[PDB]
Amino acid sequence: SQNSIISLTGNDRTVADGTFNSMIMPRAVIANEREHFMKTRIDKIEHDLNRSAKQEMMDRQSLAEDYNALNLAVGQEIKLDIATQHQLNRLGSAMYKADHERETELTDLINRIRENEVTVNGILENQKAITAAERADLLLEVVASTAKSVSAAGRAAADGSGVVPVFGPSVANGIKVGIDIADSVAEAAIAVKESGIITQLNDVYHAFQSVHVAPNDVIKPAAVVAGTSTELIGNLQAIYSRLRSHSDIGFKKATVGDVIPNSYMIKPVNSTEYASWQLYVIHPVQGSLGLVVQLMGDALTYNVFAQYGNTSASEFGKTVLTGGATNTALEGTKVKFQTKVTAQQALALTMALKDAASMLSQGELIGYFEQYINLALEPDNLSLQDNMHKYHHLLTSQNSPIDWNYHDEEMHKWLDSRKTTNYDAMQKKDGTVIADIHIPKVFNDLRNTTLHCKLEGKQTIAGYTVYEYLIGPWAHYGDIDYSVVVDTLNEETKWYCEVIGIDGHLLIEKSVQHKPEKILELTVNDSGVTSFNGRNHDRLKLKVYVKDSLSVKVFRNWIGINAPRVKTKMFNDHIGVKYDYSHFDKNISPAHLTLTDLGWHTWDQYNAGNWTNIKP
Amino acid sequence: MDVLSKGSLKELLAHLEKTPLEEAISYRIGTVPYQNVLISRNEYYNQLYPDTTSLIDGVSREGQRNVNGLIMSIISYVVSGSGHYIPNIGFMLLRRSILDILTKHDTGLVTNNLNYGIIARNLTVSKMNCEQRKRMLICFKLLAYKDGNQNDYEIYLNQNIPLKQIAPNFIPGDMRTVIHNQDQLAIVGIPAYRLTQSTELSIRDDNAKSYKLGYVDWYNSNSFLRERSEFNLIRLKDRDTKYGKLNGW
Amino acid sequence: ANRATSAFLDNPHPVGVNYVDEGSRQFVAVAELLASKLIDSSRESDESNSDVPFVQAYSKFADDNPRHLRVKTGGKMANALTNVIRSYYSINAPAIVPQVEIDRLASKATVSGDMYNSYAIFNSVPIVEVLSPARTTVSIVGSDRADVTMLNTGAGAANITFNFGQIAETVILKGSVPFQLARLNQPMPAARFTYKLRPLDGPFIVVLPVGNPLVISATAATRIQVPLAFNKALVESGFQTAMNDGLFDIQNVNYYSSFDEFIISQYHAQDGINRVSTCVILGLALQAYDQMRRALPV
Amino acid sequence: ANRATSAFLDNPHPVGVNYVDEGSRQFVAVAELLASKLIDSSRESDESNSDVPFVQAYSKFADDNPRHLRVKTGGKMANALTNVIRSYYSINAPAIVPQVEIDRLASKATVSGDMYNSYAIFNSVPIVEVLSPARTTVSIVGSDRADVTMLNTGAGAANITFNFGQIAETVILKGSVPFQLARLNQPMPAARFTYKLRPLDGPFIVVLPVGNPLVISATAATRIQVPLAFNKALVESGFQTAMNDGLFDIQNVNYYSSFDEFIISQYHAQDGINRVSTCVILGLALQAYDQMRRALPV
Amino acid sequence: ANRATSAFLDNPHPVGVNYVDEGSRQFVAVAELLASKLIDSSRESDESNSDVPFVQAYSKFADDNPRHLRVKTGGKMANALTNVIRSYYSINAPAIVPQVEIDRLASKATVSGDMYNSYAIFNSVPIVEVLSPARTTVSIVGSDRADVTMLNTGAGAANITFNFGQIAETVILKGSVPFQLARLNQPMPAARFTYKLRPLDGPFIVVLPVGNPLVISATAATRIQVPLAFNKALVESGFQTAMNDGLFDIQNVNYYSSFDEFIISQYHAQDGINRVSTCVILGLALQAYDQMRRALPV
Amino acid sequence: ANRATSAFLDNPHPVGVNYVDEGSRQFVAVAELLASKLIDSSRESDESNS
């Protein structure tokens, strides 16, 4: 027919139950209370499996000692004895680990593409009729990617631990919320007050759920119109630069002292009537813009609103993009849900669904939308899926209808102002000591805060376990210090640290086990580029080799508090300067090492292979 | 009005054979079916009179675009005289007769998933009178015979005791059963009692009395066909015949 | 590389699927015949110094005698004609004219119901895609005559790929300065001002010398089967009248400057051969609308 | 110095020299009258509910009573009109049709073969040449509306010379911004938006200041003697149909988007007066071709 | 071992199960008779100048009088025949023609409506299976005439098994060089060029000597009961027209180059006795389709 | 790369340009009708014994 999108139900809008078409129809996960209850239980189980509340409580004392041993300046120390800082560290540490792992997988994908750029260029140029999903399969096969599936089922199987979204209610379980002092400036009373968070922080955690996008999701929008390998890589980096900036904003909302809003769906109080209408309000915690979607009958309308600069009277800010008239004053039952996709991903499907509003049934429109928001499940309709990915690229590209850099900058300024206002208000009410406990000024942004990233190692070379940490990219400029903590069963041990650059690596041998040891100090300019031994670099790789290891931690610290920001890179900025990461794969064997091998040595000195012994 | 005047099974099925589906469908927007409303009845009360609108009223209502709405529009036309608002059905379906939709597979409409209990409840079978329930049961039997669902029709009658007593007796494939049937299915007709130009309280009763009073005017109008005085002027194709058989019966 | 396309060829909205049967096709043709008689009745009234010619014309069209103090709206035929125009434009526009009313109006006069008796030439030029190298910029402006401006900023001469579709019969290219154009594998000829091309011949390669920009003007001709009474002058006037009257004011539709652009855009869409058939009936409906509304302005 | 000229004025190919006598011109006039009656026979057929009006007109045109199975094509008159059209376009086209057949067909109707009874106005803009200084760029785009985009990069203001020929009667210039234009060896006036010029006055000098580009839009009017029956709407439609059917596909010929460009280009040739007389007969032949082929599509 | 099979025998799709009753078969027979009269009416209209034979033939076929300005389409009978043809090819094709319309059209002429009066010979060769040893290569090409190319690269002579099914009546094999052929477990005769075989006799063994390849050309004759009006030439022409007109594009259907190999492929499937009955009715419908469409194109 | 083409598609020689007018095409049609009657006259001759 004329329509490219064909509804599973015909023009009669009736599908017989028990038939194949009805079996493959999408389900309303948000609207169905059985479906919503099941999704929440599985999500909580996944979080509790990887992150154990009983384990995090036990490791509190060990982490507190390490943070003090960093010898930070006054006003920049992180005190984990305070309950508020410990809760913020728990959320931040898991947030940064997930972002770190996604960045690591992106670098491997970039290296794989560059190794087979001739075959990749042929696929992109010759084949344009196939969909985005089919193009991703061919690319992920031509390159020897570890994960070769873009299907949601294959992604979940190969997702692995460490990238599981954080579940706020699990983190906030069992923490004291109400403590009174009643005008008692005493050491015992102040110690008691430091043990409890306030109600505002409890409400923030109950409405928090992080979103982390795998590189196998990003590849489909990246290759939808890409014609060359450079365009594909440039699109991949542009999307992840936007994602990382939004992820930073998400953590900053917990630091400032206000309650974050919760996404909800409004549906009519009376079920099974003629009149059918639904209103979705999405408040992405990891973003600066929101979405309001209204479906009355077969008509779909949307409005993109700013999450900043809003008075207390109205939750919605100014409208930055309009797609119709949406009434948010509709009366009905309110069902709260947690979005699992970014604002751009939600917006991309809304534009695609509006185009095919009359070509799909209402149940298909609702089921496809709710499955994406609540499960990150892409629509099974291939034609609908392809249009969504085309809109996702447009929302990210330079021709985007939304100026993302302007809105992200405004969100940062608005959040900083709110922190100052809330700190001054509580200072007058209670005092400086109480205000500092509840609103710590040391945390600020996610990549500005001093944070630790526990490392997991599955590779053992001659009895030495390799722990890999990727240094950079940096969204801030200043001076950065890196430290490593090594816990080993043996009483005396020798461990090695290696930093890989574009031309050569630096080998370090250390012996101190439990106290943190500084490994690398760097200076980064306003372009997010550091000068590592005469060569400009955008990121570095740090590998720790430890024998009979139990735990390895890496601490990131900025010299100054509230480090100034670096403008987010776009597609034009990424294609301008190209850095080679093919050297991040090579390893060394600490067992076969000599005194002459330690230090900074360029590749020319080594042979082919044998990156341990410096004899050519 | 013409559909409500038919008083025998033979006349009802004969009318449905010559009546296309577009007569069942209405092109007026109407209102949503189930609503508690206040109407004005000044002949009886000064205050507004509460009532609930329904699909078997004589006034067009808005209908669902699915097949369920189409069948529910056909039955409402038979029992109430007006259908519902289901636009953009298509030329191919609308040109077919009502009997063809209910009885023939060649129309292209699939109706085997229909539930008689849900359709009856949506049509407010409790509010229907004896003639209205008999007419709806005729529609159910024709649909059951089309889909090979004769057993399901009988079980649905067993669950509903009042429906079993008044269920018309005819085999939807044999014309001999239709001729023998003597059930009175007329909703409007010449009244033996005193019929006055007075209003009724409920929407259904008031709308029904409008058709009853309109039929009296139609009976004496020039449009009415008087078989006793003008039988020779009728065309032979549509002239009344003792050996009148529906096609395929 | 960059892709440039004509604005009017982008996203043709689906057209209506109702009132396309033989019975409804007679109604549109009958309405056109009777709406024409209203226009000529004005001149005959002046010659005869009487309103008898107009009374006969209006009575046949509206089924009521003209009366003073009553706004002459055209009766039931005008209402039916307005609604079928609404249904033709969009598939989501409701069809609210009963078939029995369509049949009754179509019996008012006897006409040939065939909408494929004749043909017409349409002047909208389809430029589906222009492929350009990295260092060149291409801009496309216009629908009746498309001016393609290309500028080469790179060091070497560039090759620009022109795709004119497959529906158009002939395309004539004219340049501000002489240029070279050839097929995909044919050798380049000497530079000349004008070229005549068959769109089915294949993609066309144009060399772009470095220096001053080169502007190519395109003109195309397309043949579409239409009823013999079709008149492009009257259809275009009706298209503008319908847009101003709000007959096309419905959500999720595209808007075009002329009926020429509308019919060409639907032709190039998927299922184009069966979309132009509906658009032709819309054109004859719009031709009747223009004549009727000019005689009876409301 | 750089010279820019209109694309459609370049290299007008010689027109044919056959079928220009009084007898042949009468045949073209007869065909146009008979073809016009053929189109109006369709409207009369609908009113009469019969094919009698059409059968009458086809019998006059094609000298045979049509049979239902046969595909109506026009008979000998249609063949004669087609070959006559090809001969007019090019001097290389053969003259198949004998003079005996032309004389027989010319006797079918009583109409004069005159071609100078009336006039017509043609809107092609003849920019013969534009001479510009070295540091300036000039581009000419369009025929019905000529847009001249001029940009200079030198420090001083430049003088651009416009030559519109001698044939055109009136040329109206409009600019994006007010500009200065004066005749050769005449004082420059104040900047104005619009200028009305007579091409016989002489070359015109335009002051081009340094800065943003200046665009001048040009429209022209030319009077050419034509028969009274001449109709520009039908001639232009016939021109596109002739190109579509390949009647103009001959070696060593030029191609034009409209009959307006064709006749104006030939008028500006050295033997313009002799060429135009042949082109006017072609226009009436194309007018008959448009009517005959729409009534009898093949 | 290796196995080779004829391409056209692979995966015969199910056929329709509607319009196979006596009344429907009468409609197909009536359409064939009336369509034949349409073609014959053209020649009669040439011997006598009148168009009476065509008007009579078309009026019976289309239930309306032919008109000069209206396209001749065949009327309700043409629509019924086209839709009925679609139903036979696939079981997924909808059956939308009402039975009351089929019965009405079957009353136009008095014909037998019987499908088993006569027979016809079909020339497709059903090579169901060719079994070859390890070191031999076998390739089968062709449907009307099948050439089997066999090459032996082994040390000794190889035995190749030929299975021709049980349906075909006679098979004639001719080789490029003389070869040896015998039934299973039977002594082998002297080499000779040609063999006449009965497929029901059993699998056939061919000796393949080491050396130059041996090519066997196969031809088969099969007898299938058909109506007395069956004409193979008309059926084959109608089959090609239906494929080009889009009547056979349904999801999950096999495609064949000829009607000959379509009926033979269905005959070799399970329940092939019942499938051939439907295919024969499709052949007579295609015979009617060809004559009607040639007389009334589009 | 190697190119293979159908033998019968190679180098079609130009066809004649005469006897394509309406009168000439009628002559071909007349001859076909008259020649067809000539063949059927043989069968009619046998039936009539003359």
Torsion of CA A190, A193, A195, A200, to 10 degrees: -150
User: Contacts of residue B95 in chain C, CB cutoff 8 Å?
Assistant: 99
Query: What is the separation of C-alpha A207 from the centre of its chain, rounded to a whole number of angstroms?
Result: 16
Give strand pairing partners of A277: A296
Determine whether the interchain pair C18/B22 forms a contact, defined as Cβ–Cβ distance below 8 Å.
no
In B, minimum Cα distance to E93 occurs at: B108
Tokens 């200072």, residue located: A427
Residue F40 at interface with chain D, using a CB cutoff of 8 Å? no
A to E contact (≥3 Cβ pairs closer than 8 Å): no
Determine whether the interchain pair B90/C98 forms a contact, defined as Cβ–Cβ distance below 8 Å.
no
- The closest of C264, C238, C215, C246 to C8, measured between CA atoms, is C264
B68–chain A nearest CA distance, Å: 8
User: Contacts of residue F22 in chain D, CB cutoff 8 Å?
Assistant: 73, 75-76, 79
Question: Which pair of tokens denotes residue A401?
Answer: 């209808």
In C, minimum Cα distance to D9 occurs at: C193
Residue A297 at interface with chain C, using a CB cutoff of 8 Å? no
* CA–CA distance, A292 with A305 (Å, rounded to integer): 8
Contacts of range A418-421, beta carbons closer than 8 Å, 24 or more positions apart: A418/A256, A418/A257, A418/A258, A419/A255, A419/A256, A419/A257
Q: Is A23 exposed, middle or buried (0-12, 13-18, 19+ CB in 10 A)?
A: exposed
Q: How was this structure determined?
A: cryo-EM
Q: How many residues does chain F have?
A: 50
In E, minimum Cα distance to B96 occurs at: E98
User: Contacts of residue B104 in chain E, CB cutoff 8 Å?
Assistant: 98
Determine whether the interchain pair C212/D139 forms a contact, defined as Cβ–Cβ distance below 8 Å.
yes
In chain E, DSSP finds a helix count (H) and a strand count (E) of: 7, 10
Instruction: Label residue B148 left, alpha or beta by phi (over 0 means left) and psi (-120 to 50 means alpha).
Output: left
- The closest of A137, A132, A170 to A154, measured between CA atoms, is A137
Give strand pairing partners of A552: A455, A486
In B, minimum Cα distance to C99 occurs at: B22
Give strand pairing partners of D216: D148, D175
A to F contact (≥3 Cβ pairs closer than 8 Å): no
Strands of C204-208's sheet in order across: C2-4, C129-132, C158-163, C204-208, C181-182
Q: CA-based angle D106:D112:D114, to the nearest 5?
A: 115
Determine whether the interchain pair C112/E69 forms a contact, defined as Cβ–Cβ distance below 8 Å.
yes
Contact B187, B1 (CB under 8 A): no
Q: Which H helix or E strand runs over C27?
A: helix C22-48
* CA–CA distance, B189 with B197 (Å, rounded to integer): 16
Residue D79 at interface with chain F, using a CB cutoff of 8 Å? yes
In C, minimum Cα distance to A353 occurs at: C252
Contact E96, E106 (CB under 8 A): no
* CA–CA distance, E97 with E107 (Å, rounded to integer): 16
User: Contacts of residue D69 in chain E, CB cutoff 8 Å?
Assistant: 41-42, 45, 51, 54, 295
Residue D44 at interface with chain E, using a CB cutoff of 8 Å? no
User: Contacts of residue C21 in chain B, CB cutoff 8 Å?
Assistant: 91
Determine what percent of chain F falls in helix, strand and coil, rounding each to the nearest 5: 55, 0, 45
Q: Which of A14, A17, A275 sits opposite B67 (nearest CB)?
A: A14
Q: Is E158 helix (H, G, I), strand (E, B) or coil?
A: strand
Contact A496, A556 (CB under 8 A): no
Determine whether the interchain pair C117/E69 forms a contact, defined as Cβ–Cβ distance below 8 Å.
yes
Q: Which residues in C252-264 are b (16+ Cβ under 10 Å) and which e?
A: bbbebebbbbbbb
In F, minimum Cα distance to D94 occurs at: F17
* CA–CA distance, A123 with A136 (Å, rounded to integer): 10
Residue F45 CB neighbours (<10 A): 10
F33–chain D nearest CA distance, Å: 16
Task: Output the CA–CA distances (angstroms, integers) from residue D38 to C101, C118, D111, D190, D229, in the order listed.
Answer: 34, 13, 16, 58, 16
Determine whether the interchain pair A2/C91 forms a contact, defined as Cβ–Cβ distance below 8 Å.
yes
* CA–CA distance, B87 with B92 (Å, rounded to integer): 13
Determine what percent of chain B falls in helix, strand and coil, rounding each to the nearest 5: 45, 5, 50
* CA–CA distance, D39 with D50 (Å, rounded to integer): 15
Contact A305, A318 (CB under 8 A): yes
Can you list the alpha helix ranges (DSSP code H) found in chain B? 2-5, 9-18, 67-80, 91-94, 98-103, 116-122, 130-147, 150-159, 161-165, 175-180, 203-220, 227-230
Question: What is the β-pairing status of strands D214-226 and D118-122?
Answer: antiparallel
Determine whether the interchain pair C194/D8 forms a contact, defined as Cβ–Cβ distance below 8 Å.
yes
Contact B128, B76 (CB under 8 A): no
Q: Is A454 helix (H, G, I), strand (E, B) or coil?
A: strand
Phi and psi for A539 in degrees, rounded to 5?
-160, 160
Other chains touching C, judged by 3 or more CB pairs under 8 Å: A, B, D, E
Phi and psi for C122 in degrees, rounded to 5?
-115, 140
Residue F23 at interface with chain D, using a CB cutoff of 8 Å? yes
Q: Which of C1, C269, C270 sits opposite A227 (nearest CB)?
A: C1
* CA–CA distance, A442 with A420 (Å, rounded to integer): 13
User: Contacts of residue C14 in chain A, CB cutoff 8 Å?
Assistant: 2-3
Amino acid occupying residue E295: A
Question: Which pair of tokens denotes residue A447?
Answer: 């990549």
Cα torsion B167, B173, B179, B184: sign? positive
Q: Which of C20, C96, C99 sits opposite B94 (nearest CB)?
A: C99
* CA–CA distance, A58 with D63 (Å, rounded to integer): 110
Question: Which pair of tokens denotes residue D80?
Answer: 């004669």
Mutation target to probe the E interface, by most E beta carbons within 10 A, among B91, B99, B106, B247 is B106
User: Contacts of residue E100 in chain B, CB cutoff 8 Å?
Assistant: 247-248
Q: Which residues in D33-65 are b (16+ Cβ under 10 Å) and which e?
A: bbbbbbbebbeebbeeeebebbeebbebbbeee
A599–chain C nearest CA distance, Å: 45
* CA–CA distance, E81 with E27 (Å, rounded to integer): 9
* CA–CA distance, D86 with D94 (Å, rounded to integer): 8
* CA–CA distance, E150 with E152 (Å, rounded to integer): 7
A13–chain B nearest CA distance, Å: 5
E99–chain B nearest CA distance, Å: 9
Determine whether the interchain pair B91/C18 forms a contact, defined as Cβ–Cβ distance below 8 Å.
yes
Contact E180, E217 (CB under 8 A): no
User: Contacts of residue C109 in chain D, CB cutoff 8 Å?
Assistant: 46
Question: Which pair of tokens denotes residue A561?
Answer: 């508090």
DSSP code for D201? G
Give strand pairing partners of A553: A454, A485
B to F contact (≥3 Cβ pairs closer than 8 Å): no
Can you list the alpha helix ranges (DSSP code H) found in A116-228? 117-126, 132-142, 152-158, 168-171, 187-193, 199-206, 215-222
* CA–CA distance, E243 with E293 (Å, rounded to integer): 13
Determine whether the interchain pair E71/C113 forms a contact, defined as Cβ–Cβ distance below 8 Å.
no
User: Contacts of residue C113 in chain E, CB cutoff 8 Å?
Assistant: 70
